[PDB]
């Protein structure tokens, strides 16, 4: 179980889901900086408008 842990465009990095954690989430949304993309293991909450794509598989937020 893996999950990308970066955002925007810097060199992609991967983090193996931590104990208890086993999901993968992709938080994509634009703002004043431009297209913003958060990612990591799990599936947190968000603000109305932001697009949250969660998958219980490996590497799914790149």
Swiss-Prot record:
Tissue expression per record: Expressed by the venom gland.
- Location of site Moderately important residue for binding to acetylcholine receptor? 6, 9, 25, 32, 34
Per the UniProt record, the site (Key residue for binding to acetylcholine receptor) maps to: 8, 10, 27, 33
Main localization is secreted
Which residue positions hold the site described Very important residue for binding to acetylcholine receptor? 7, 29, 31, 36, 38, 47
Looking at the keywords, is Disulfide bond present? yes
Disulphide bonds annotated for this chain are 3-24, 17-41, 43-54, 55-60
Q: Which UniProt keywords apply?
A: Acetylcholine receptor inhibiting toxin, Disulfide bond, Ion channel impairing toxin, Neurotoxin, Postsynaptic neurotoxin, Secreted, Signal, Toxin
The ranges of region (Loop III) come to 43-54
Query: Which residues does the annotated region (Loop II) include?
Result: 24-41
Question: Annotated region Loop I: where?
Answer: 3-17
Q: Which segments carry the region annotation Stretch between loop I and loop II?
A: 18-23
Protein origin, superkingdom: Eukaryota
- One cellular component term from this protein's GO annotations in UniProt: extracellular region
Where does this polypeptide localize?
Secreted
Q: Recall the GO molecular function terms of this protein's record.
A: acetylcholine receptor inhibitor activity; ion channel regulator activity; toxin activity
**Which family is this sequence assigned to?**
Belongs to the three-finger toxin family. Short-chain subfamily. Type I alpha-neurotoxin sub-subfamily.
The task this protein performs is described as:
Binds with high affinity to muscular nicotinic acetylcholine receptors (nAChRs) (tested on Torpedo marmorata, Kd=0.07 nM), and with low affinity to neuronal alpha-7/CHRNA7 nAChRs (tested on chimeric alpha-7/CHRNA7, Kd=22 uM) and inhibit acetylcholine from binding to the receptor, thereby impairing neuromuscular transmission. Produces peripheral paralysis by blocking neuromuscular transmission at the postsynaptic site.
Protein name in the entry: Erabutoxin b
**Which species expresses this protein natively?**
Laticauda semifasciata
Shown portion of the whole protein? 22 to 83 of 83
């Amino acid at each position: 179980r893996i999950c990308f842990n970066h955002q925007s465009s810097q060199p992609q990095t991967t983090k193996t889901c931590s104990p208890g954690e086993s999901s993968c989430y992709h938080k994509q949304w634009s703002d004043f900086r431009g297209t913003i993309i958060e990612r990591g293991c799990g599936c947190p909450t968000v603000k109305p408008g932001i697009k949250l794509s969660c998958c219980e598989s490996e590497v799914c937020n790149n």
